[PDB]
Amino acid sequence: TSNVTVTVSDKDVLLEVQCRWEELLMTRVFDAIKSLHLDVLSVQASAPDGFMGLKIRAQFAGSGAVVPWMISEALRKAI
Amino acid sequence: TSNVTVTVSDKDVLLEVQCRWEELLMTRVFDAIKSLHLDVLSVQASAPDGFMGLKIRAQFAGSGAVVPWMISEALRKAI
């Protein structure tokens, strides 16, 4: 049971992820976020009972328009 | 005006940071955390007004002993 939710309005990006935690998961998520040129402005994340729940609010820092499915793809690749 | 607090108990690590937010701050912090081989298990972070507040609980993933001043120094450079 695992969900990836991406909400995009102009340059504002909301990310929610729920999945089974495994080692270095949070690191892969933030690597993905870095590689999407997303600037994180707030995060709540924890993994009680080995199940990660993550909520991130971010802003797009690169050039051009945001491609939401690319965000969704990178997160799914990270978990 | 900035505060960095690092607590180490065996392999558990608790980081708290308060400083002025600026662009890509969160990314520099997680870059630092990655390069310290810390596996992040929980994060609460936000910057209401321009002032970032951050609490991270992590576990050391590398070999050998944790070197606490390493963590605090890398965090200070990330600011």
List the CATH number of the domain containing A36. Answer: 3.30.70.260
Judge contact between B72 and B8, C-beta under 8 A: no
Chain A residue nearest residue B30, CA to CA: A30
Q: At what angle do helices B25-35 and B68-78 cross, to 10 degrees?
A: 160
The SS3 assignment for B56 reads strand
Substitution target from A24, A31, A42 for chain B, most B beta carbons within 10 A: A42
Give the amino acid at A57: R
Q: Please, is A54 exposed, middle or buried when counting C-beta atoms within 10 Å of its C-beta (0-12, 13-18, 19+)?
A: buried
Domain span holding position A24: 3-78
Query: Measured between alpha carbons, how far is B38 from B35 in angstroms, rounded to an integer?
Result: 8
Query: Measured between alpha carbons, how far is A50 from A48 in angstroms, rounded to an integer?
Result: 5
CA dihedral in degrees (B48, B49, B50, B51; nearest 10)? -50
- How many domains is chain B built from? 1
Report how this structure was experimentally obtained.
Answer: X-ray
Q: Can you give the three-state secondary structure of A5-72, one letter per residue?
A: EEEEECCEEEEEEEEECCCCHHHHHHHHHHHCCEEEEEEEEECHHHEEEEEEEEEECCCCCCCHHHHH
- PDB resolution in Å: 2.3
Dihedral of alpha carbons B63, B67, B72, B78, sign = negative
- On whether any CB of chain B is under 8 Å from the CB of A14, the answer is no
Q: Which of A4, B78, B48, B65 has its CA nearest to residue B56?
A: B78
Judge contact between A4 and A79, C-beta under 8 A: yes
Beta bridge partners of A13: A8, A58
Token output for B51: 């002032």
